[PDB]
Amino acid sequence: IVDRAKMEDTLKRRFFYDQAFAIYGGVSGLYDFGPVGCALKNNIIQTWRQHFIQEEQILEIDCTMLTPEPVLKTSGHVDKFADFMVKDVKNGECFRADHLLKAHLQKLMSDKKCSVEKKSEMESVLAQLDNYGQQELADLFVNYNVKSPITGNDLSPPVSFNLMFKTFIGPGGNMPGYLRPETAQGIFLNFKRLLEFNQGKLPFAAAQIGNSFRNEISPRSGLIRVREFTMAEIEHFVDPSEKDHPKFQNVADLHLYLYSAKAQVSGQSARKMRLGDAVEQGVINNTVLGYFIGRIYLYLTKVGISPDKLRFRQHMENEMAHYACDCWDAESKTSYGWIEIVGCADRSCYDLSCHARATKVPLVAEKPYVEEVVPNVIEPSFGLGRIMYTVFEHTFHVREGDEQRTFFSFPAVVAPFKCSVLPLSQNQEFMPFVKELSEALTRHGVSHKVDDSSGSIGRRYARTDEIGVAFGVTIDFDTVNKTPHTATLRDRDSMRQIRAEISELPSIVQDLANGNITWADVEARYPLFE
């Protein structure tokens, strides 16, 4: 439960992000990231690089965004990559039928005049929205007589709208192209050279961290629905008969909420199972999928996503992506409800075969005399933007004070900068201490910034808390004149303080940020300071 309004005001005021081309009216689905937004975004990307690429020794490549039409036609995007769209016969307003129908039912379930039986009927309908096809969705639009949310007009029947941006490569219109809606294709077209890196053996994973474009019909979810974003995609090529991951046992003991396809059709809630158990019973197909689901859980959690607002939902029969057979999405509970922030599909051998057949170029591998096989690929897809937004709503808090101050309980690994060093005076009296502390923090690899802003220490930290700085060190006169020279350490979340010699604080902060020590531990060793 978060006050989106108040938050968007803080994120825009401190400039995490904001409307792109604001002075022109702004384009929906487009936003720019300010200084703190980039710092946070970079921390999230770097953390991701460590968690996956570095942890699994994934091969990295950087493919182009521009894509010639033939490529996307083969992958099947030109035909299936789209959302159903509607528009009132009056003017040309377009809406994503998928979501309009959802906002309409929620409207009816909110009206007190709604009976219990109908409320239930509608709930069952929403829990199957991603299944309904061209026709099924057309009927519901009639049964509920759905009409334009603005000055209720009559909506035309739901039709498919390809989400890919169109363009022309080079002069003339002989080579029409698109902006890649995902990165996966780039890795597939370079399968041979990539497979070659691993001696030609399976399994192995390739990844990409770049921009993708989706000409979203009607973006109205802030950063949740942009037409341009950064995504990290991992393509894990494995033997279709060796779909077993050697490291699964590393996450087999995690307890996370799973919402299987069955539980969705049988109308029951999601369960909090143990990964290992989930695979045993058959809920989660194999262990390769199970490993990544665990690593994903760990990543999102480490970055700041709340376990109580995180779950993995499996796709339904006809919800499947045109390229997948099985899939699980990491959805986060937000002010916009449950939304996927990480897609993890098991798109068998769809891709490699399509390109192989179309280009007349074989894309396979061998196994022991020797047999050739088309690697099944599990694709963990990360929408960094959505992941960051979720972090905002899950760590945004209002201080218990009339002044209505706000702060983000950002984990030390993602916060703009771990420590904030703020002295009272700037005279050559404090510099000797500020300089030393700063450099000391630098030797400990602790990002920091010397606060100069005007106002009382309390007001100084107020700004620090707004952008989620994890810790702060106050350097007052008792630090310069008294001896031993001690400074004040402040915990962002609790606002509680500590007093210790300014030469020891560096290592203390380091351990606090690296999770080697608890704020509790700190209060146990050093004297409290109010």
Ligand X SMILES: Nc1ncnc2c1ncn2[C@@H]1O[C@@H](COP(=O)(O)OP(=O)(O)OP(=O)(O)OP(=O)(O)OC[C@@H]2O[C@@H](n3cnc4c(N)ncnc43)[C@H](O)[C@H]2O)[C@H](O)[C@H]1O
Closer to a second copy by CB, 83 or 326: give it: 83
Task: Report the partner that residue 22 touches, choosing among ligand X, a second copy, none (CB closer than 5 to 8 A by kind).
Answer: a second copy
Q: Which residue has the tokens 């009816």?
A: 108
Q: To the nearest whole angstrom, how small is the minimum distance from the Cβ of residue 359 to a second copy?
A: 4
Residue that is written with structure tokens 């996966």 in the block? 184
- Nearest approach, Cβ of residue 381 and ligand X (Å): 4
Task: Choose, by CB under 6 A, the member of 93, 239, 340, 511 that binds ligand X.
Answer: 340
CA dist 139 and 416 (Å) reads 49
Q: Concatenated DSSP letters for 10-23?
A: HHHHTTSEEETTGG
- Cβ count near 9 (within 10 Å): 12
Report the partner that residue 80 touches, choosing among ligand X, a second copy, none (CB closer than 5 to 8 A by kind): ligand X
Bridge-based pairing state of the strands 271-274 and 255-259? antiparallel
* Binding-site partner at residue 133 among ligand X, a second copy, none, CB < 5 to 8 Å by type: ligand X
Residue matched to tokens 């509680």 = 496
**Token pair listed for 496:** 């509680």
Q: Which residues are annotated as a binding site?
A: 182, 214-216, 225-226, 233, 340-341, 379-381, 386
Using the rule CB under 6 A, which residue among 186, 343, 375, 423 binds ligand X?
343
Which residue among 11, 71, 207, 321 contacts ligand X (CB under 6 A)?
321
Per partner kind, with CB cut-offs from 5 to 8 A, the member of ligand X, a second copy, none near residue 381 is ligand X
Region 147-186 residues binding a second copy, contact defined as CB under 8 A: 161, 165-172, 174-175, 177, 179, 186
As a whole number of angstroms, the distance between CA 473 and CA 470 comes to 11
Pick from 14, 104, 180, 225: which binds ligand X (CB under 6 A)?
Answer: 225
Helical pair 287-303 and 35-48, crossing angle rounded to 10 deg: 150
Q: Would you put residue 89 in left (φ > 0), alpha (ψ -120 to 50) or beta? A: alpha
Instruction: Identify what 340 binds: ligand X, a second copy, none; CB under 5 to 8 Å per kind.
Output: ligand X
Q: Is 82 in the site for a second copy (CB under 8 A)?
A: no
Instruction: Report if residue 342 touches ligand X, rule: CB under 6 A.
Output: yes
> Contacts with ligand X in 64-83 (CB under 6 A)?
80, 83
Residue 156 DSSP one-character state: P
In the region spanning residues 411 to 440, those forming contacts with ligand X, defined by CB under 6 A, are none
Shortest Å, Cβ 306 to a second copy? 26
Say whether residue 91 binds a second copy (CB under 8 A). no
Site for a second copy in 326-385 (CB under 8 A): 355, 359, 361
What amino acid is encoded at 295 in this protein?
Answer: R
Residues of the binding site for ATP: 214-216, 225-226, 340-341, 386
Question: Considering CB distances under 5 to 8 angstroms, the limit depending on partner class, which of ligand X, a second copy, none binds residue 386?
Answer: ligand X
Integer Cα distance of 15 and 19 in angstroms: 10
C-alpha 36 chain-centroid distance = 17
DSSP 229-283: EEEEEEEEEE-TT----TTGGGTTT-EEEEE-HHHHHTT---EEEEHHHHHHHTS
Q: Running DSSP on this structure, what letter comes out for residue 487?
A: E
Does 450 bind a second copy (CB under 8 A)? Our answer is no
Q: Which long-range contacts (CB under 8 A, 24 or more apart) does 157-161 make?
A: 157/86, 158/84, 158/85, 158/86, 158/97, 158/134, 159/84, 159/85, 159/86, 159/134, 160/82, 160/83, 160/84, 160/85, 160/134, 161/82, 161/83, 161/84, 161/85, 161/94, 161/217
Q: Which of 385, 416, 468, 506 binds ligand X (CB under 6 A)?
A: 385
Strand, coil or helix: 284: coil
Query: How many residues contact a second copy, by CB under 8 A?
Result: 64
Q: Indicate whether 60 belongs to the interface with a second copy (CB under 8 A).
A: yes
Q: Does 439 sit near a second copy (CB under 8 A)?
A: no
Q: How far is CA 247 from CA 58, 184, 240, 289, 416, in A?
A: 15, 24, 18, 11, 32
> Interface residues with a second copy (CB under 8 A)?
15, 18, 20-24, 27-35, 37-39, 41, 59-68, 70-71, 85, 92, 94, 161, 165-172, 174-175, 177, 179, 186, 189-190, 193, 197, 211, 213, 215-218, 227-228, 355, 359, 361
> Interface residues with ligand X (CB under 6 A)?
80, 83, 130, 133, 163, 214, 216, 225-226, 229, 231, 318-319, 321, 340-343, 381, 383, 385-386
